[PDB]
Amino acid sequence: QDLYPSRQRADAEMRPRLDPVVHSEWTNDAPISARQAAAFDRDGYIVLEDIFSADEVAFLQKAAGNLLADPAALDADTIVTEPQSNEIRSIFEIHAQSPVMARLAADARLADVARFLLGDEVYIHQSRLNYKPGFKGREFYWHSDFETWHVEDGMPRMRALSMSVLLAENTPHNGPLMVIPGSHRTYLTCVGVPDEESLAELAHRHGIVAPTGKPGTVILFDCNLMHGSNGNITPFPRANAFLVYNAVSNRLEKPFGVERPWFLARRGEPAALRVERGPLV
Numbered sequence: 051q052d053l054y055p056s057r058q059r060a061d062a063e064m065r066p067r068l069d070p071v072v073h074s075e076w077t078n079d080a081p082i083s084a085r086q087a088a089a090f091d092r093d094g095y096i097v098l099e100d101i102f103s104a105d106e107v108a109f110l111q112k113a114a115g116n117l118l119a120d121p122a123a124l125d126a127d128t129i130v131t132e133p134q135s136n137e138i139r140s141i142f143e144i145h146a147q148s149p150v151m152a153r154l155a156a157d158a159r160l161a162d163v164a165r166f167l168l169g170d171e172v173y174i175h176q177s178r179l180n181y182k183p184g185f186k187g188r189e190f191y192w193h194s195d196f197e198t199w200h201v202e203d204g205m206p207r208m209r210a211l212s213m214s215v216l217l218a219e220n221t222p223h224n225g226p227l228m229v230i231p232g233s234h235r236t237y238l239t240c241v242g243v244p245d246e247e248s249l250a251e252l253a254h255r256h257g258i259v260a261p262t263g264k265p266g267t268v269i270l271f272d273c274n275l276m277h278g279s280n281g282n283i284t285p286f287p288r289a290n291a292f293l294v295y296n297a298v299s300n301r302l303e304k305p306f307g308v309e310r311p312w313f314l315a316r317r318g319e320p321a322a323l324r325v326e327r328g329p330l331v
């Protein structure tokens with residue numbers, strides 16, 4: 051019933067993973083190589099480079115800039131801010147509010163990878179446009195998306211993946227997203243923040259890797275990969291579009307816990323995203 055119980059005991063447990071990581075057999079029809087599929091299964095993430103042209107990247111950058119500079123045009127429920135100061139930090143449900151980001155989510159070069167890896171038709175569980183500025187950028191502490199999606203949102207199986215489309219450069223120096231490769235095969239229960247000893251254990255066994263890339267690079271990770279990021283004192287901002295794909299067969303149920311606002315998760319009984327091909331501009 052609850053295959054992945056968390057926030058119930060007082061102590062923390064490392065339970066095994068009971069879902070595949072790659073939900074499809076590999077063949078020459080797959081949108082990715084055999085080695086990339088194997089890397090995903092083993093590490094829980096992979097990095098796609100050079101899949102969008104220079105113009106498409108400039109287009110997506112240009113577009114994100116406009117969204118971020120124009121909060122009057124959008125649903126106030128979806129905005130996240132520097133409190134106080136009036137600075138836009140995130141925008142949820144951009145895939146619904148932005149015809150450009152809607153088209154991004156549906157691009158084959160992303161959606162076909164997700165349908166393969168998730169071995170199913172897919173829909174967006176959540177989307178974000180994110181801007182971490184220079185000088186004053188916060189850390190996001192270590193967490194597993196799935197642990198929250200399960201407990202708070204009712205996502206029942208590890209059958210989803212996040213896609214982070216970089217829009218500003220990630221150097222090693224400006225708090226790029228950091229992962230613990232392999233951590234996706236352990237479900238770490240929370241007493242919802244993971245605990246120091248477990249975290250240390252994972253990082254000692256597996257190490258840390260913080261993949262970088264020029265704008266337009268795409269970082270894909272399993273829903274249960276343990277990840278996070280340092281702050282950023284540099285003048286160089288971080289900005290990405292964050293897209294979470296879920297298998298349609300893995301639709302949300304009632305939360306495995308006590309309750310979460312609509313813009314954080316499509317609770318609905320949703321339908322398959324329709325893949326679009328050819329360039330963006």
Ligand SMILES: [Fe+3]
Binds near residue numbers: 195
């Ligand atoms: Fe996250």
